[PDB]
Amino acid sequence: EFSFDLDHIEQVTSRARGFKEFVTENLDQLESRAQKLVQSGQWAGAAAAAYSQAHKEWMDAARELVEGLSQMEEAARTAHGAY
């Protein structure tokens, strides 16, 4: 019924989901601790600009990472019969 290959796809997709969760959880922790520093004023001027730039990059990238995963999940669903 449900071949080895489909179970393999589902396992890889599951690892990609675990990876996405790991990435977002830790970026969340980083943003939370760093944003305190901008909030307190300890990071101002060039220091804030540097953080802001990196944060912009990883936020836009995180979105691209989730959208990609979403495509993988729809595809794996399609392969399993969940059209």
Partner: protein
């Protein structure tokens, strides 16, 4: 000290994301030896977009890690 801590945190996360991303890339590519058709194709381009995002994250983490480590005083 929080500045040093965040530099180490960002650097460590970068190392883990790079490893994770390369590992997933190998796993994903191995599926295409047997999985063919429109869903396989869509999965491949989903992964390409996911890996692209992961790379941009890794690059941003490495950059801020280095700036915080090397320019600690301005922070």
């Amino acid at each position: 000290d929080e500045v040093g801590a965040l530099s180490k945190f960002a650097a460590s996360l970068a190392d883990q994301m790079r490893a994770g991303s390369n590992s997933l890339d190998r796993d994903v590519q191995s599926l295409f030896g047997v999985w063919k058709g429109s869903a396989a194709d869509a999965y491949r381009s989903g992964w390409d977009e996911m890996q692209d995002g992961a790379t941009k994250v890794w690059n941003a983490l490495t950059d801020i890690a280095s700036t915080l480590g090397s320019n600690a005083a301005a922070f």
